[PDB]
Design goal:
The structure is cut from a larger assembly and holds two copies of chain A. By secondary structure, chain A is mainly alpha-helical. Helices cover 36% and strands 0% of the residues of chain A. Chain A is rod-shaped, with a radius of gyration of 35 Å. At the A-B interface, helix 1 of A face loops of B. Chain A: It comes from Scylla serrata reovirus SZ-2007.
Chain lengths: 50, 50
């Protein structure tokens, strides 16, 4: 056996495992709530007589 | 190839070397520049022995 291929294979598999073990899962999504604004009731036309 | 390897084909000596060195790593942490845990506190109490 060529002892220099085993070392390279071990290094490669160790690098793969180390790379796979650093990935993090973090999400910073917003919320579905809607910001509300001010409003004023409007007046419908009316007629007054006595 | 898997059957060929299982039938008495010996592993590269480094396997046992790493297994034996990992035990050394556990027993003396600060020789390899790592600490298991840290304590954050506002009123520290010194260890008199040191």
């Amino acid at each position: 056996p060529n002892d220099e291929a085993t070392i390279k294979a071990l290094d490669n598999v160790i690098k793969q495992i180390e790379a796979l073990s650093v990935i993090v899962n973090r999400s910073e999504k917003a919320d579905d709530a809607q910001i509300l604004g001010p409003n004023t009731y409007k007046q419908l036309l009316e007629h007054l007589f006595s | 190839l898997k059957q060929i390897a299982s039938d008495g084909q010996g592993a590269h000596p480094i396997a046992a070397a790493i297994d034996q060195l990992r035990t050394i790593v556990y027993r003396e942490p600060e020789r390899f520049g790592y600490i298991d845990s840290v304590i954050l506190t506002h009123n520290p109490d010194v260890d008199t022995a040191y």
